[PDB]
Design a protein around this nucleic acid. Structure first.
Ligand SMILES: OC[C@H]1O[C@@](CO)(O[C@H]2O[C@H](CO)[C@@H](O)[C@H](O)[C@H]2O)[C@@H](O)[C@@H]1O
Ligand SMILES: [Mg+2]
Length: 580
DNA sequence: GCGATCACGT
DNA sequence: TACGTGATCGCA
């Protein structure tokens, strides 16, 4: 069974062919400034294993790695590229990434290692990484004999599976999606992650001090109002203090007891003064624990930068996710938490943070896909879309639209995009079911094209077995035919929403690629730092702001051409908070 | 360790 | 109502 390969003590010419499956192993989940434990190369001349100290010190190998004409097939090339960047080594010529290929073929498989991807094609001559390295406390690099065969088997799998995966991608019309979108994007993400974002740690530490004080205060007030101490951070103990010791009304229940979600607490506020305090305490506690303490834990002490990792092969819709730290969920709704952004600053003196965001990209994408005359016209006039919906569903002139009417029309717009049900619309607007249903009905009368799209997309999902996005990304929906109403309904909402969220994902990804090409042509020093679903955050010399104000929005607006215009707003300042 | 519940983002 | 990450609790 053992697979044959050369355990090389030195790099040789035949190891540098112009086409090879390459494995540059980084076992640490967070690959930033992490160790490379081994290298495997499989090509026309055979299978090879190279120790990193050797390979990475060989100028011929390093040259081969950076030679864009020497093509490499890999799995999670971003991981290798970044780990190499920290060692001052450039990786070029990656023409096939099995992780991204598998992700595009079926995001639902959750492929996160070569073995998982290989299984899709009935290839099982490779072990799962977890089986080799273990997990958690037991996770460690095996002895060279075991490590070497594993890396060679992974490279061998990649070598064998490239053609099969490319053939299916082609059949799915996703060949360009991999080659012209995801693979180029992977390199851009590597640059962004490697660059990192500078943090004003002293500012965060000061906020932490101010929060600790406020928490202690509110914390005491809570015990005083409850005439006793308990773990406020325990939905369990809290549920007892509120619904048992204080007799507060039980408006909502959970799977294991009473609900203490902010949602319910808001309704309970009128009954007792402790509720407001619990809400406030949670607000502050989230800021302290997740953001202040959290960020401080991952900031690099030497550079004061945080280096997130953008998981490019995880979400079912094509969006990216961000981890350790997640820089796509930094507070902004509430002013107090929003101030956390004042701690994200430019990495160099006299540089500024520039942020550009698409305005209502989901609803604009919906107008395009559904080809709804009323909705397309609304955007062609660049109308306030929520006021417009209110005018239509409540039958009133612009002047007759009250704040509450807009607030509700807004909730309906978001619900439509999410495939909201008459019930979930009530839960959100805290209204009835038949009422929320009447709203939805009024919406479809005003936007018949959208109603038709929602009906047609669900039928298409049932017929084909999947739905697709603008750039041909796909998501299988087997539950669309489930005879269990709830399971089927969730699938139906996904059928309606995925093409919208997914196409919006496609668009900003292409914008990022187009943008970097533009930045290079103009030789601007400006560069991307983050992507937050419908917005791009960059940093650049103050002298480049005027050029960026015109360049960034244009590139983002022209990424794709829809039946309605794409609109991008932008702001810049001395900190992320100020880029408003 | 892991499911349940909470809260942060688009 | 769509899509995420993660801190904390509590029993295994
Ligand atoms: O390197 C990112 C890439 O690796 C996968 C596994 O193939 O995720 C690993 O790394 C992430 C970043 O540290 C972790 O969040 C995740 O837990 C770990 O398995 C892919 O999912 C991802 O695309
Ligand atoms: Mg926006």
């Amino acid at each position: 069974a053992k697979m044959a390969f050369t355990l090389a003590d030195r790099v040789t010419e035949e190891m540098l062919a112009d086409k090879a499956a390459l494995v540059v192993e980084v076992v640490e989940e967070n690959y930033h400034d992490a160790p490379i434990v081994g290298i495997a190369v499989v090509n026309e001349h055979g299978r090879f294993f190279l120790r990193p100290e050797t390979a990475l010190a060989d100028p011929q190998f390093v040259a081969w790695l950076g030679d864009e004409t020497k093509k490499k097939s890999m799995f999670d090339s971003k991981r290798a590229a970044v780990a190499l960047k920290w060692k001052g080594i450039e990786l070029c010529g990656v023409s096939f990434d099995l992780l991204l290929a598998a992700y595009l073929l079926d995001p639902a498989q959750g492929v996160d290692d070569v073995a998982a991807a290989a299984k899709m094609k009935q290839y099982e001559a490779v072990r799962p990484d977890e089986a080799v390295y273990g997990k958690g406390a037991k996770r460690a690099v095996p002895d060279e004999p075991v490590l070497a065969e594993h890396l060679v088997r992974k490279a061998a799998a990649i070598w064998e599976l490239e053609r099969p995966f490319l053939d299916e991608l082609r059949r799915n019309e996703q060949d360009r999606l991999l080659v012209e979108l995801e693979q180029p994007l992977s390199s851009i993400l590597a640059e962004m992650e490697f660059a990192g974002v500078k943090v004003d740690t002293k500012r965060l530490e000061q906020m932490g001090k101010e929060l600790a004080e406020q928490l202690g205060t509110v914390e005491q007030r809570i015990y005083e109002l409850a005439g006793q101490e308990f773990n406020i951070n325990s939905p369990k103990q809290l549920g007892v203090i509120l619904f048992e010791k204080l007799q507060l009304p039980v408006l909502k229940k959970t799977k294991t007891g009473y609900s203490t979600s902010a949602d319910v607490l808001e309704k309970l506020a009128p009954y007792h003064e402790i509720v407001e305090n619990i809400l406030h305490y949670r607000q502050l506690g989230k800021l302290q624990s997740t953001y202040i303490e959290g960020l401080l834990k991952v900031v690099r002490p030497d550079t004061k930068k945080v280096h997130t990792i953008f998981n490019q092969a995880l979400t079912q819709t094509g969006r990216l996710s961000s981890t350790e730290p997640n820089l796509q969920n930094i507070p902004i709704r509430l002013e107090e938490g929003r101030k956390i952004r004042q701690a994200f600053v430019p990495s160099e003196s006299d540089w500024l943070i520039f942020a550009a965001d698409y305005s209502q990209i989901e609803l604009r994408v919906l107008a395009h896909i559904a080809e709804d005359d009323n909705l397309m016209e609304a955007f062609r006039r660049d109308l306030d879309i929520h006021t417009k919906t209110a005018m239509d569903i409540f039958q009133v002139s612009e002047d007759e639209v009250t704040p509450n009417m807009r607030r509700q029309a807004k909730a309906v717009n978001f619900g439509i995009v999410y495939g909201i049900s008459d019930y979930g619309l009530a839960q959100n607007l805290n209204i009835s079911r038949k009422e929320a249903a009447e709203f939805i009905e009024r919406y479809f009368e005003s936007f018949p094209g959208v109603k038709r799209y929602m009906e047609n997309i669900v039928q298409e999902a049932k017929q084909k077995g999947y739905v697709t996005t603008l750039l041909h990304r796909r998501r299988y929906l087997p539950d669309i035919t489930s005879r269990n109403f709830n399971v089927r309904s969730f699938a139906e909402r996904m059928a309606m929403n995925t093409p919208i969220q997914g196409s919006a994902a496609d668009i900003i990804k292409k914008a990022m690629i187009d943008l970097n090409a533009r930045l290079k042509e103009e030789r601007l020093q400006a560069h991307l730092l983050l992507q937050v679903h419908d917005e791009l955050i960059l940093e650049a010399p103050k002298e480049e702001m005027e050029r960026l104000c015109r360049l960034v929005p244009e590139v983002m607006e022209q990424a794709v051409t829809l039946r309605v215009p794409l609109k991008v707003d932008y702001h810049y300042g001395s900190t992320w908070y100020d880029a408003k």
